[PDB]
Write an enzyme that holds these catalytic residues in place. Sequence first.
Site, PDB file in Angstrom:
ATOM      1  N   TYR A 155     -11.231  -3.386   2.800  1.00  0.00           N
ATOM      2  CA  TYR A 155     -10.232  -2.616   3.948  1.00  0.00           C
ATOM      3  C   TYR A 155     -11.319  -2.754   5.196  1.00  0.00           C
ATOM      4  CZ  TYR A 155      -6.749   0.171   5.966  1.00  0.00           C
ATOM      5  OH  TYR A 155      -5.779   0.412   6.432  1.00  0.00           O
ATOM      6  N   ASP A 170      -4.945  10.655   8.120  1.00  0.00           N
ATOM      7  CA  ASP A 170      -3.655  10.242   8.836  1.00  0.00           C
ATOM      8  C   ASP A 170      -3.202  10.952   9.989  1.00  0.00           C
ATOM      9  OD1 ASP A 170      -2.543   8.153   7.047  1.00  0.00           O
ATOM     10  OD2 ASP A 170      -2.775   9.638   5.246  1.00  0.00           O
ATOM     11  N   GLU A 195       0.925  -1.275  -0.064  1.00  0.00           N
ATOM     12  CA  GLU A 195       0.027  -0.175  -0.200  1.00  0.00           C
ATOM     13  C   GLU A 195       0.733   1.236   0.222  1.00  0.00           C
ATOM     14  OE1 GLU A 195      -3.252  -0.724  -0.359  1.00  0.00           O
ATOM     15  OE2 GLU A 195      -3.572   1.503  -0.727  1.00  0.00           O
TER      16      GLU A 195
HETATM   17  O1  LIG Z   1      -0.846   1.303  10.551  1.00  0.00           O
HETATM   18  P1  LIG Z   1      -1.675   2.624  10.594  1.00  0.00           P
HETATM   19  O2  LIG Z   1      -2.387   3.122  11.793  1.00  0.00           O
HETATM   20  O3  LIG Z   1      -0.639   3.791  10.121  1.00  0.00           O
HETATM   21  O4  LIG Z   1      -2.634   2.443   9.254  1.00  0.00           O
HETATM   22  C1  LIG Z   1      -2.093   2.518   8.002  1.00  0.00           C
HETATM   23  C2  LIG Z   1      -3.168   2.561   6.699  1.00  0.00           C
HETATM   24  N1  LIG Z   1      -2.591   3.007   5.839  1.00  0.00           N
HETATM   25  S1  LIG Z   1      -3.505   2.914   4.404  1.00  0.00           S
HETATM   26  O5  LIG Z   1      -3.007   3.275   3.082  1.00  0.00           O
HETATM   27  O6  LIG Z   1      -3.899   1.312   4.664  1.00  0.00           O
HETATM   28  C3  LIG Z   1      -4.883   3.782   4.783  1.00  0.00           C
HETATM   29  C4  LIG Z   1      -6.353   3.318   4.530  1.00  0.00           C
HETATM   30  C5  LIG Z   1      -7.410   3.959   4.779  1.00  0.00           C
HETATM   31  C6  LIG Z   1      -7.102   5.520   5.179  1.00  0.00           C
HETATM   32  O7  LIG Z   1      -8.253   6.296   5.373  1.00  0.00           O
HETATM   33  C7  LIG Z   1      -9.563   5.733   5.196  1.00  0.00           C
HETATM   34  F1  LIG Z   1      -9.731   4.604   5.901  1.00  0.00           F
HETATM   35  F2  LIG Z   1     -10.288   6.750   5.649  1.00  0.00           F
HETATM   36  F3  LIG Z   1      -9.808   5.348   4.178  1.00  0.00           F
HETATM   37  C8  LIG Z   1      -6.046   5.838   5.506  1.00  0.00           C
HETATM   38  C9  LIG Z   1      -4.910   4.845   5.223  1.00  0.00           C
END
Ligand SMILES: O=P(O)(O)OCCNS(=O)(=O)c1ccc(OC(F)(F)F)cc1
Lengths: 395, 268
Positions: B175, B60, B49
């Site tokens: 997801y 984020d 990803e």
């Molecule tokens: O391990 P962490 O806590 O840093 O999370 C990593 C996630 N990275 S990601 O690209 O999958 C990812 C997936 C979804 C996100 O936002 C949404 F849910 F609103 F769509 C943001 C980042």
Amino acid sequence: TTLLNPYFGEFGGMYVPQILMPALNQLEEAFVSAQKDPEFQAQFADLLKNYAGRPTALTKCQNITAGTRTTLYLKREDLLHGGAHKTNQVLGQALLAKRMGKSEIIAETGAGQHGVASALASALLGLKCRIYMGAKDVERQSPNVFRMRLMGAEVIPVHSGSATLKDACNEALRDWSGSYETAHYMLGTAAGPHPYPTIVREFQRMIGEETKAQILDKEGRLPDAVIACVGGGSNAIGMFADFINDTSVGLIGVEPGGHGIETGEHGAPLKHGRVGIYFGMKAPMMQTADGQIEESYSISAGLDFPSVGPQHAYLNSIGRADYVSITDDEALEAFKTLCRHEGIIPALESSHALAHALKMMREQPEKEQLLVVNLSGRGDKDIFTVHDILKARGE
Amino acid sequence: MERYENLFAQLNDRREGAFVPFVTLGDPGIEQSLKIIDTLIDAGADALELGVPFSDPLADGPTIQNANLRAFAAGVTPAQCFEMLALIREKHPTIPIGLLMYANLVFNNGIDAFYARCEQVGVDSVLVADVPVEESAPFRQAALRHNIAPIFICPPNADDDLLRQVASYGRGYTYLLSRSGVTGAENRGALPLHHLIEKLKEYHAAPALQGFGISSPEQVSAAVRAGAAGAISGSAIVKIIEKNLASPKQMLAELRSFVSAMKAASRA
Ligand SMILES: O=P(O)(O)OCCNS(=O)(=O)c1ccc(OC(F)(F)F)cc1
Ligand SMILES: C=C(/N=C/c1c(COP(=O)(O)O)cnc(C)c1O)C(=O)O
Ligand SMILES: c1ccc2[nH]cnc2c1
Ligand SMILES: c1ccc2[nH]cnc2c1
Ligand SMILES: c1ccc2[nH]cnc2c1
Ligand SMILES: [Cs+]
Ligand SMILES: [Cs+]
């Protein structure tokens, strides 16, 4: 699915992470319910009258239009409890938060007027309030930081990005996306995701409603134009709403021109940006060629935001409202002029609206025109900023 | 989307879950980012990803905010990200690559053109963080026309209508959000909700990957034990980059040990 239209033409929508959609739908549902609830409306009306001091005065300028054919009135939102129009819709949203069983409030603030409004409503109605404010704004609008904290709100300086309003908005939204089960996000302008642009308009629309009744009483006719500054859109849509269907009444919104549009240091996306998606909405944005959101600039913290509410984008698109810009120097001249000739100290945000009305008059001094400026706030928060500038000069 | 289908069939044959690291493209610089990604793959990442740096990443937390900032300090643009993606795909023909996008970057100069660029470079999925299913039509349509999987989010409190929409609209993987809030290693998400996992399966949804706050091998194992097809970790990986900025070699060694440990946990 929603109960109400999230769009104004192309603009608006609900561009938030999926996590927040139920909160937005819950808020929309509570709003629709409250709008038809006589007890809610009676509570809201009572607070507006007996607590905030509505209706606000409509003042005819006596001096600043001398020698011209312009008649200028000022809608006195500077006289509202708290010192700006922000207090109106905060009272309604605070009641909604209570209606939804929330005991916590999150708010962004730039000028600190929405922060003060959020703090005072939370003190009154028994809510725990936390406020995000860009660190630059903490300095240039410092009197409001003291006011918020005296009222028991937590003020959280934001150092990220430009350390101004957009960065406060970002932090507020990030916080809400984890705290929405117990916290209501009390968004302070007619922007962001649906239902906010709609709720904020409906909870500010007394401004135009009163203005209409007052100008009819004093002049026997509608204004030729109503003029309001546009930071996110709330004071302007509050003034505009009741006049939209009065086709003869010009609706003029004033964006911050900052150091000059040509410098790129401004906050005028409606006229100088392009459509993008940010802060939960599809709306005109200051953005780079690649689509990164740009940092805005205005002398006024309340206008210093690189987007604008979708209903203004829409009203502009169809030609129902016209939008213009006013520079820092123009706003400062209008500020000085009102202080010295009418005995009113306006917010620098509101001084952009006044500056445009003064230009309308000065450019065409024999044009017969009846104008109303929304004087959105008082300038106590700005006096140290303005003093320092006029000193670094020589006035 | 085919690269995900092949991966999940392979992992199912091995009775294995997926481990999927997140990093920001071009953090801390283009050349180091490319080496970081090669190290993630060599250490056993099943898929990637990859974030395109954005000015205002509102889903984020500070760790990934700071990754975006480092990439910008190195002058990273979306065009350079696409240059990197070409290079990654040229080295690694089968690994699935998902992008983590914010809406403005996709919408900017045309949604269609964005997904066309993704297909041209060999990206497999796009997750647009600030587009809920309710606003997704032009994004998912453009994705599917360009053979890109659009990724949707199943939050912890997802109702049945949402589960059905996510199952119908999404491809590649689903997801499965571990918790509310924004990305962050410190804020550990709850166990995968079994009823969501089970409902997604009932509705023939793309296989679930759990993400947000997954920062230890124990959480990866728990995700797979609960029935998820795997787990995504971002902030935990990015923290290793942030910690080792002055030591590129130590960075890669520590990324390798961590990713290996996370992947081993997915075999449980
Ligand atoms: O391990 P962490 O806590 O840093 O999370 C990593 C996630 N990275 S990601 O690209 O999958 C990812 C997936 C979804 C996100 O936002 C949404 F849910 F609103 F769509 C943001 C980042
Ligand atoms: C951003 C803020 N203020 C905005 C503001 C504005 C511009 O915001 P709207 O476009 O939402 O009215 C106008 N007038 C006054 C007195 C204001 O304080 C704030 O108080 O947080
Ligand atoms: C969604 C909900 C209500 C509406 N009214 C008009 N368009 C709409 C869209
Ligand atoms: C820009 C300008 C002034 C500031 N004060 C604190 N942070 C700032 C950023
Ligand atoms: C623009 C953006 C956010 C705001 N909150 C209060 N006034 C605003 C103007
Ligand atoms: Cs006059
Ligand atoms: Cs603005």
